[PDB]
Design an enzyme around this catalytic site. Structure first.
Site, PDB file in Angstrom:
ATOM      1  N   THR A   1       0.794  -1.205   0.000  1.00 36.00           N
ATOM      2  CA  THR A   1       0.000   0.000   0.000  1.00 36.00           C
ATOM      3  C   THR A   1       0.841   1.277   0.000  1.00 36.00           C
ATOM      4  O   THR A   1       0.634   2.163  -0.838  1.00 36.00           O
ATOM      5  CB  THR A   1      -1.035  -0.041   1.158  1.00 36.00           C
TER       6      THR A   1
ATOM      7  N   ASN B   1       5.984  -1.862   3.405  1.00 35.88           N
ATOM      8  CA  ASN B   1       5.116  -1.409   4.495  1.00 35.88           C
ATOM      9  C   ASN B   1       5.886  -1.333   5.805  1.00 35.88           C
ATOM     10  O   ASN B   1       5.480  -0.613   6.722  1.00 35.88           O
ATOM     11  CB  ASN B   1       3.846  -2.248   4.615  1.00 35.88           C
TER      12      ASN B   1
ATOM     13  N   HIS C   1      -8.410  -8.865   2.729  1.00 32.93           N
ATOM     14  CA  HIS C   1      -7.502  -9.596   3.599  1.00 32.93           C
ATOM     15  C   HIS C   1      -8.250 -10.680   4.398  1.00 32.93           C
ATOM     16  O   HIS C   1      -7.746 -11.801   4.578  1.00 32.93           O
ATOM     17  CB  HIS C   1      -6.788  -8.654   4.579  1.00 32.93           C
TER      18      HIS C   1
ATOM     19  N   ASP D   1      -4.324   1.017  -5.673  1.00 33.56           N
ATOM     20  CA  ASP D   1      -2.899   0.899  -5.418  1.00 33.56           C
ATOM     21  C   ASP D   1      -2.327  -0.509  -5.810  1.00 33.56           C
ATOM     22  O   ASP D   1      -1.184  -0.603  -6.203  1.00 33.56           O
ATOM     23  CB  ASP D   1      -2.575   1.309  -3.974  1.00 33.56           C
TER      24      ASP D   1
ATOM     25  N   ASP E   1      21.974   0.687 -10.070  1.00 34.04           N
ATOM     26  CA  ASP E   1      21.120   1.883  -9.995  1.00 34.04           C
ATOM     27  C   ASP E   1      20.185   2.063 -11.221  1.00 34.04           C
ATOM     28  O   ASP E   1      19.435   3.041 -11.305  1.00 34.04           O
ATOM     29  CB  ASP E   1      21.948   3.151  -9.765  1.00 34.04           C
TER      30      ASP E   1
ATOM     31  N   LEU F   1      21.061   2.455 -14.230  1.00 34.54           N
ATOM     32  CA  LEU F   1      21.614   3.452 -15.140  1.00 34.54           C
ATOM     33  C   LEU F   1      22.977   3.014 -15.695  1.00 34.54           C
ATOM     34  O   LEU F   1      23.792   2.416 -14.981  1.00 34.54           O
ATOM     35  CB  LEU F   1      21.789   4.775 -14.378  1.00 34.54           C
TER      36      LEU F   1
ATOM     37  N   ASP G   1      26.648   2.377 -16.578  1.00 36.65           N
ATOM     38  CA  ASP G   1      27.904   2.679 -15.856  1.00 36.65           C
ATOM     39  C   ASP G   1      28.886   3.438 -16.719  1.00 36.65           C
ATOM     40  O   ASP G   1      28.981   3.210 -17.934  1.00 36.65           O
ATOM     41  CB  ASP G   1      28.614   1.404 -15.417  1.00 36.65           C
TER      42      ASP G   1
END
Ligand SMILES: *[C@@H]1O[C@H](CO)[C@@H](O[C@@H]2O[C@H](CO)[C@@H](O[C@@H]3O[C@H](CO[C@H]4O[C@H](CO)[C@@H](O)[C@H](O[C@H]5O[C@H](CO)[C@@H](O)[C@H](O)[C@@H]5O[C@H]5O[C@H](CO)[C@@H](O)[C@H](O)[C@@H]5O)[C@@H]4O)[C@@H](O)[C@H](O[C@H]4O[C@H](CO)[C@@H](O)[C@H](O)[C@@H]4O[C@H]4O[C@H](CO)[C@@H](O)[C@H](O)[C@@H]4O)[C@@H]3O)[C@H](O)[C@H]2NC(C)=O)[C@H](O)[C@H]1NC(C)=O
Ligand SMILES: Cc1ccc([C@]2(C)NC(=O)N(Cc3ccc(Cl)c(Cc4ccc(Cl)cc4)c3)C2=O)cc1
Ligand SMILES: [Ca+2]
Ligand SMILES: [Cl-]
Ligand SMILES: [K+]
Ligand code: NA
Ligand SMILES: [Zn+2]
Length: 806
Positions: free
Chosen positions: A159, A180, A265, A308, A687, A689, A691
């Site tokens: 959530t 969470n 749930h 969500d 990351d 991205l 290198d």
């Protein structure tokens, strides 16, 4: 301490949060235990309920009532939402036919149509069809507005990570809400659903929509609601804020519902007890839309109805226990449930070994319902690694299952029948999107998209400039009737060289050999044309990729393939080729088994060498354009060029060779030709991205040949598969992957079998968007097509998920 004996008189649901210890009357005061003494009496009125009845019509105002039916209520902005229906013969919004909203129809003084975000927790995508009979208001929003069949949440499909992704356009790894529950080593602090630590701002990174708006002079309602504030009161407060004078009135609002997640749930996603929560959410939508229609705003406001994450069936008995696998179970801490995250119980322990923990959890039971990963080896599409809050060891849990440390943790916490948190490509985790209003399209279905894209659209809806985020601005233009954003292609930073023949064979001492000296103006004119780009329009269907960083590289042409060869990384950044439906697979002839040929276009000093591979006992090599797919015995010599070679672990070559020998041809026959772009990826700091050279952690032994962390391929064909890939007049179809370059196949539990039982399964797991590969390579694909750029951006955000039909 709060001097809670100030007062909320004339302050109910004030928009500015007052500075302690002055008491608070905002929609979060309850959560901080800091409301003024009279908050309940003044701000949470309930007398007489939420609906006008015939006998209340034109009553004398009684300020005690929850909402009003007195004649003055409209101008005061505090009628019950059904006031006009009961007391003025008006129809409910849901009973009116829908009519296209071509232009905003707003009261004087509105500078822009307001945006209202109606977010619903646990609203699984299939509820739209399965629950359609009991959700008439929602069904009308859906069929009259713009809707996707589903919306992909982010991983983990919990959530807080998803709501905060909705607000920021950021992956959880960048916004910092990575679960969470979390531990942060630099703060040395923990974050939980219950408790006060979550209220500290240091957990919440990026820039959420309400702050983007404020900074740009657009006023924002509060997005958070204290749980005990009932839904009817949330709606009435939004409607009241909408009646404020122009200088005080917010332009963006959010409503949040705890349902259907709360009930999901308890009863599972499709429990019979799930009908009533869906009825009740629909009724709340109805209250809003009737309230909007009363204020003459129902053809002025843009409404977003958004979930969500979904909800899956999960019970106690489907729990795997780490105690059945580990002996040191008390030396670890597990964040448990629908994902696992493992760290050491104590950092004053130098005996703790991540390597040994992983090995004890890998393929240990035949039906194992989770799979351990070092986080950097997780599928790149999950973007779940670059945060100190994400533990190095991760467990991907099978849908319908839980992981726990020990049985005592489960029966000393059966309660639940539903849960979520699983891989964000799983069908049961998909959620919903509907946009309705003047700025959205009329009766329009759009393809599924990722919730990371909405922040950009919400900014567009409000005339805001988005903060930097992970959406691809423009990829959702097709949702909108009028866009204020018009994306442009990034400029190429490095232009290529086009080398001709510049070196003699004998200048190379690379320790390579080839039996090719087994060697006429027909065939010699031909091969020169090929090396100059005569066949390029066949193998480069969408233009060459643009290099978006500063580097040195060469375009190399060949009969069967073109490449962009990096003089810095000593290998191609990309290799492009087309395989028609009719193409033939051949083998590597016996005399060419170990053939590697110097490329006379490229200096020895910018080439790989065979000796390095001979010396490196772990590292072998493969080819980017596959020799199996050469168009002719003579074109086949091109595939053995040292400039087509890349470093590969032998375990990885099993994957790669099956892809090149078997799967490319299968895709070409199923898709009526495919264009393939393949290449290496270097992401040693995980990351997401590209290198730089100074970031590479592994080289082929004794050399400057960097070892990729991953290999990608992008496979493009015509959406109308009655047209061949190389002659496609309209929209494109793409699937892509980013395979991790690993020295073992531990990830695949079936790997001792034939590649036909496990390889394709691995590639499906590592499916990717072209956009993920762009970030990872600093390249920009599809620069020359006949399609609009917005359509191309949608294409680059596509993910082929391999899930069946929802
Ligand atoms: C998804 O979209 C997002 C957003 O566009 C992309 O993330 C961006 O990536 C950029 C490049 O990696 C990054 O730029 C760096 O920012 C540094 C300043 O950052 C602070 O300020 C910004 C702006 O307000 C703020 O947003 C940042 O927020 C991060 O950190 C805070 C506090 O710690 C967190 O609350 C927050 O959640 C967020 O954390 C995330 O990012 C950090 C990295 O910044 C990660 O560590 C976390 O795991 C988490 O993911 C910051 O408060 C800036 O200082 C950097 O500059 C260095 O590098 C450049 C390279 O050009 C160099 O020129 C500079 O000189 C400098 O080098 C010096 O520092 C080095 C490291 O300390 C050192 O080694 C050198 O020797 C030098 O001393 C850098 O420019 C940008 O901040 C983030 N933004 C966000 C919001 O995450 C993301 O890439 C996209 N994802 C994909 C897959 O595409
Ligand atoms: C720090 C804090 C304070 C209060 C609370 C409360 C009571 N606990 C809780 O679970 N919620 C809901 C909630 C969860 C996360 C976020 Cl980000 C949002 C904002 C939002 C809304 C819609 C969209 Cl589309 C995006 C963001 C709302 C609360 O308000 C949660 C967290
Ligand atoms: Ca990187
Ligand atoms: Cl979590
Ligand atoms: K070797
Ligand atoms: Na294996
Ligand atoms: Zn939940």
């Amino acid at each position: 301490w709060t001097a809670t004996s100030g007062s909320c008189k004339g302050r109910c649901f004030e928009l500015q949060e007052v500075g302690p210890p002055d008491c608070r009357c905002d929609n979060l005061c309850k959560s901080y235990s800091s409301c003024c003494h009279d908050f309940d009496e003044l701000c949470l009125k309930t007398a007489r309920g939420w609906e006008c009845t015939k006998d209340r019509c034109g009553e004398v105002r009684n300020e005690e009532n929850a909402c009003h039916c007195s004649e003055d209520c409209l101008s005061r902005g505090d009628c019950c939402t059904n006031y006009q229906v009961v007391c003025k013969g008006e129809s409910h919004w849901v009973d009116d036919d829908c009519e296209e909203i071509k232009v905003p129809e707003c009261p004087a003084g509105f500078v822009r149509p307001p945006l209202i975000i109606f977010s619903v927790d646990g609203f699984r995508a299939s509820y739209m069809k399965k629950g359609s009979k009991v959700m008439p208001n929602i069904e009308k929003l859906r069929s009259c507005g713009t809707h996707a069949p589903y919306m992909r949440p982010v991983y983990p499909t919990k959530t807080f990570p998803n709501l905060y992704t909705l607000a920021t356009g950021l992956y959880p790894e960048s916004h910092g809400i990575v679960g969470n529950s979390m531990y942060d080593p630099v703060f040395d602090a923990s974050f939980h659903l219950r408790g006060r630590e979550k209220f500290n701002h240091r957990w919440w990174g990026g820039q959420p929509l309400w702050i983007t708006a404020t900074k740009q002079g657009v006023r924002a309602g509060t997005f958070f609601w204290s749980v005990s504030i009932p839904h009817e009161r949330r709606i009435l407060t939004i409607l009241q804020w909408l009646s404020l004078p122009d200088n005080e009135r917010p332009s963006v609002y959010a409503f949040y519902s705890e349902q259907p997640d709360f009930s999901g749930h308890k009863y599972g996603p499709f429990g019979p007890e799930m009908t009533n929560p869906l009825r009740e959410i629909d009724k709340t939508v109805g209250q809003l839309m009737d309230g909007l229609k009363q204020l003459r705003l129902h053809r002025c406001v843009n409404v977003i109805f958004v979930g969500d994450h979904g909800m899956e069936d999960v019970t106690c008995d489907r729990t795997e226990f780490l105690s059945n696998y580990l002996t040191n179970v008390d030396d670890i801490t597990l964040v448990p449930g629908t994902l696992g995250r493992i760290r050491a119980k104590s950092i004053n322990n130098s005996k703790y070994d991540p390597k040994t923990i992983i090995a004890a959890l890998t393929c240990k039971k035949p039906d194992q319902h989770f799979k351990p990963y070092m986080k950097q080896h997780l599928p790149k599409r999950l973007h779940y690694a670059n945060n100190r809050r994400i533990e190095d060891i991760h467990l991907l849990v099978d849908r319908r299952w839980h992981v726990a440390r020990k049985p005592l943790d489960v029966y000393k916490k059966c309660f639940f029948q539903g849960d979520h948190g699983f891989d964000n490509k799983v069908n049961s985790m998909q959620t919903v999107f509907v946009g309705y209003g003047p700025t959205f399209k009329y009766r329009t279905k759009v393809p599924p998209f990722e919730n990371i894209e909405l922040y950009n659209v919400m900014c567009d809806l409000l005339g805001l400039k988005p903060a930097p985020n992970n959406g691809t601005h423009g990829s959702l233009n097709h949702l909108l009737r009028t866009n204020t954003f018009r994306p442009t292609m990034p400029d190429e930073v490095s232009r290529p060289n086009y080398p001709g023949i510049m070196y003699l064979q004998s200048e190379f001492d690379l320790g390579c050999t080839c039996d090719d000296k087994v060697e006429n103006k027909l065939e010699e004119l031909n091969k020169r044309l090929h090396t100059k780009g005569s066949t390029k329009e066949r193998h480069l269907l969408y233009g060459r990729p643009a290099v978006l960083y500063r580097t040195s590289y060469d375009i190399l042409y060949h009969t069967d393939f073109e490449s962009g060869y990096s003089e810095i990384f000593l290998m191609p950044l990309w290799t492009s080729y087309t395989i028609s439906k009719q193409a033939e697979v051949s083998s590597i002839p016996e005399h060419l088994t170990n053939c590697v040929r110097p490329d006379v276009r490229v200096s020895p000093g910018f080439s790989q060498n065979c000796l390095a591979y001979k010396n490196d006992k772990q590292m072998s090599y493969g080819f980017l354009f596959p020799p199996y797919l050469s168009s002719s015995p003579e074109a086949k010599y091109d595939a053995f060029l040292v400039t087509n070679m890349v470093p590969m672990y032998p375990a990885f070559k099993r994957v790669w060779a099956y892809f090149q020998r078997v799967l490319v041809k299968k895709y070409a026959s199923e898709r009526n030709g495919v264009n393939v772009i393949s290449g290496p990826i270097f992401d040693y700091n995980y990351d997401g991205l590209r290198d730089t050279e100074d970031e590479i952690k592994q080289y082929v032994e004794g050399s400057s040949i960097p070892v990729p962390t991953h290999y990608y391929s992008i496979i493009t064909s015509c959406l109308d598969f009655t047209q061949p890939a190389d002659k496609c007049d309209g929209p494109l179809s793409v699937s892509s992957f980013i395979l991790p370059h690993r020295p073992d196949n531990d990830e695949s539990c079936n790997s001792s079998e034939d590649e036909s039982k496990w390889v394709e399964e691995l590639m499906k797991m590592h499916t990717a968007r072209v956009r993920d590969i762009e970030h990872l390579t600093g390249l920009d694909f599809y620069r020359k097509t006949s399609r609009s750029y917005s359509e191309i951006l949608t294409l680059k955000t596509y993910l082929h998920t391999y899930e069946s039909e929802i």
